[PDB]
Design a protein around this ligand. Sequence first.
Ligand SMILES: Nc1nc2c(ncn2[C@@H]2O[C@H](COP(=O)(O)OP(=O)(O)O)[C@@H](O)[C@H]2O)c(=O)[nH]1
Ligand SMILES: [Mg+2]
Length: 385
Amino acid sequence: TKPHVNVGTIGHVDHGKTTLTAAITTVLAKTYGGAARAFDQIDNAPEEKARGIEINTSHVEYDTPTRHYAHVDCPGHADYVKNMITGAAQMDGAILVVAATDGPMPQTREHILLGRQVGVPYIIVFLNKCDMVDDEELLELVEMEVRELLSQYDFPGDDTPIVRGSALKALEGDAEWEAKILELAGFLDSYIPEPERAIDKPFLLPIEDVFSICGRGTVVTGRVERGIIKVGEEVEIVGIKETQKSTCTGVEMFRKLLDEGRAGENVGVLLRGIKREEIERGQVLAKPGTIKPHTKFESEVYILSKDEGGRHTPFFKGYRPQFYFRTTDVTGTIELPEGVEMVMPGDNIKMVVTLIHPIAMDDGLRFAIREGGRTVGAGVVAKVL
Ligand SMILES: Nc1nc2c(ncn2[C@@H]2O[C@H](COP(=O)(O)OP(=O)(O)O)[C@@H](O)[C@H]2O)c(=O)[nH]1
Ligand SMILES: [Mg+2]
């Protein structure tokens, strides 16, 4: 029915993220129905588990007349880091909360940096605690500082919606301040475009298995990740080996002959021309010229602490783990930042990875770092080199 959008509040400690998350739920419920959530209920965030990594995060849900929002608010800076790198749902947009009394702070910069790194596509800013500021020239100064900050990290600072308000006075009931929270909900709907449906994205099928039907040819199996493959359409086999071009000669679902295969369907794609021996672990079927194979990439990664089931010892320059992209582990070489000799468990770093085999890759692709068969960390492709 109504579109679902994943948002969240980012910004420095005590700028007003939780108060704002409360005010959003409260004002939207007071204006056009729903259940209002108190500050206390969002503040003491429960602990969530993302494959062994522990993250304190509050998941609040609210509705505007057209959209349904799944909103994340975390207590500490460490949770934001973990959540942006491996968190359950990738943000479609973010609300950057900036206290007009403090202006941009170290975590303001960090969240903006991580946001682009991790591929958060839209940022709306709520200039909080304006009830405390009597100087209009001061508000303009903070606003200009925030727009400069966003532009520094490739966000369109000059075109970013900035709402001047007070999250506390709005949670309190003050109509004049409650208007500004409605203006913010308006920007969520107008500035963040409708999220792209999996079925409307270019066709991609990560290859889970290969078989060869007698007389029909090679069958490649998997769950259609995105788009639609119709019988007769041209396809590319991208991964370890040099990219191959073929044609979908059939689509099968447990004996049922389909004319097409859509996103979320477990399907068997027939390829006339391709031989079984040409298909390798980690290959992908995709709409020709929509994905490129790469070996070298820049990534933002988090290494599990011993407590999270990860290693107890640090790793060094010579570390060569397995990178689990979609279907298989691929061994990679690591380049640590200038001056970094070792990486401790529980740390996050910028890692330049060189895979032994190319992998169909785009910025924003998430992966797992495994040493045995055990997860030692998680990452996101920031830049494809
Ligand atoms: N003056 C003023 N203080 C506010 C406002 N919103 C929140 N605060 C207060 O600032 C403190 C920090 O708020 P909080 O949401 O917990 O910050 P967070 O850690 O960034 O989420 C709390 O004691 C709030 O009541 C506001 O609009 N104006
Ligand atoms: Mg908070």
